[PDB]
């Protein structure tokens with residue numbers, strides 16, 4: 106039961122650029138297609154009927170938290186790129202927290218897609234998906250947007266098998282609680298096994314730390330969704346990385362692609378490739394297939 110007048114008017118104006126009237130939106134609350142800490146995601150239809158994904162924020166009840174979440178995420182409306190998840194709009198209403206309306210992703214998240222045994226994506230398919238992610242991240246980096254939670258679970262696949270970098274902006278949540286731990290300097294639930302060494306040490310995130318995460322995502326792709334560092338406790342991830350240890354080469358990962366992964370995990374952030382370079386390198390590797 107959130108009230109508009111309470112929010113900063115500058116934020117209200119920004120939100121009203123993308124507002125969706127309740128009469129234009131039908132939500133199927135019995136059809137859950139995602140689960141987050143802030144609320145579930147439901148099959149919806151946006152009116153001419155469009156199939157969409159409706160992210161609930163009903164678990165966020167405080168106006169100060171709603172304001173902070175909207176403030177941090179609204180920039181999503183200014184992004185436009187085929188490999189970046191877009192915002193369809195925000196449904197405000199007299200009862201309940203704002204609903205975030207997102208495009209429906211027919212093939213769900215990339216991790217479950219590649220783990221599905223009937224799919225059996227080839228090495229070529231998987232490098233192609235990785236290339237798509239790199240292009241989306243190249244775009245976000247060019248907007249100086251730091252993702253902070255890039256991972257295979259957080260990329261979606263639409264009906265044409267276009268990969269959308271996701272779980273950012275107004276879509277931000279923890280959609281698989283298993284892979285977030287408070288065993289870190291911030292005390293907050295963080296994806297510690299996707300995080301760059303310097304982020305674990307200094308609590309700071311940059312595009313270069315997104316690059317580290319992208320390296321882990323490539324490793325997830327080549328292993329068809331195996332969990333990283335299964336034998337490393339969340340207590341030990343920092344010292345593991347300090348010792349110079351890294352994820353091992355996956356059986357079906359091409360040597361040059363593993364070289365790419367290792368570059369992404371260089372201890373010196375400035376030594377790691379840009380997403381622009383990653384697109385060029387992965388494109389070349391992809392093309393040999």
Ligand SMILES: Oc1ccc(Cc2nnc3ncc(-c4ccc(F)cc4)nn23)cc1
Nearest residue numbers: 139146158209210214258259271272276280
């Ligand atoms: O068809 C859709 C379904 C959910 C959304 C929300 C969203 N935004 N960013 C996201 N990152 C990840 C997931 C997600 C992860 C694991 C899972 F089992 C399920 C989902 N979801 N999501 C968007 C469209």
